[PDB]
A and B are shown apart, each in its own frame.
Chain A
Amino acid sequence: NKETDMFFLAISMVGTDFSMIGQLFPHRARIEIKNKFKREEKTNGWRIDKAFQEKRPFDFDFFAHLLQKVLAEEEKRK
């Protein structure tokens, strides 16, 4: 679940720039980004619209830090 929530936060802050999202994700490749988009769009059309409206700050340091923290916390708890 948290991976999809982070992916949705990314589409909020940066838009459908699949390349940069793939670059900032630890492992995910571009084709995986596209496949996730194709699978999610059907049920989350409203959520991607919200993302496009939600022009959230795309800070580098803050996003890297929260990525690392939440990834570590999920990996610990899962």
Chain B
Amino acid sequence: GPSGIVPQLQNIVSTVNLGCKLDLKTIALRARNAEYNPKRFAAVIMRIREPRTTALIFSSGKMVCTGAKSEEQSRLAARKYARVVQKLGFPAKFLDFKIQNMVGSCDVKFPIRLEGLVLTHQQFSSYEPELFPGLIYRMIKPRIVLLIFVSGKVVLTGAKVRAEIYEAFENIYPILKG
């Protein structure tokens, strides 16, 4: 069962369609937090402090946001960006919001011998300290990928909802323990 350590999400990724054509130069010109360098890439970057997120605009009518601590918070950040775009004069809308990715991390408070983890589970766990100290572990139920380290801390990524990260942690905990 659980050890009292609940995995905590550190990032969310989400996108939404603005539903209208936009001009990147106009956004960069009229907005304070907007960043635009067409010589490098054809998109505008947006930053706000509450939520603590980073997002982008594209002329084809697309918006992406990331950096939030929860999917509801990511939606709030996206809607704030949509409001900013609307008040800048574009006829934007908040259409087809989708959560794309969310990351989590946890710990077990005991060492994990990665040698044992690889030599019992070589079929889906890949271990290669030289380029990456941690052990890389992919899984099917749910479609998640993990990073397991010597200290016992684990990073979880690829989920759409916190339930997936929780159940992934519960699935791996008996493997981590023994």
Residues of A at the B interface (CB closer than 8 Å) are 15-19, 41, 45, 48-49, 52, 55
Contacts and interface: CB of A to CB of B under 8 A. Distances in A.
B49 A19 contact: no
B34 A15 contact: yes
B34 A17 contact: yes
Nearest to A21: B35
Contacts of A18: 35
B47 A16 contact: yes
A15 B37 contact: no
Does more than half of chain B's interface fall in helix, strand or loop, or is it mixed?
loop
B49 A17 contact: no
Nearest to A19: B37
Nearest to A18: B35
Interface in B11-61: 28, 31-37, 40, 47, 49
A18 to B, nearest CB: 6
A74 B36 CA distance: 31
Nearest to B35: A17
Contact of B32 (A16, A19, A41): A16
B49 A45 contact: yes
Contact of A52 (B32, B36, B37, B40): B32
A17 B47 CA distance: 9
Nearest to B37: A19
B46 to A, nearest CB: 9
Contacts of B47: 16
Contacts of A15: 31-34
Contacts of B35: 16-19
Contacts of A52: 32-33
Contacts of A19: 35-37, 40
A39 to B, nearest CB: 15
Nearest to A14: B32
A48 B49 contact: yes
Contacts of B40: 19
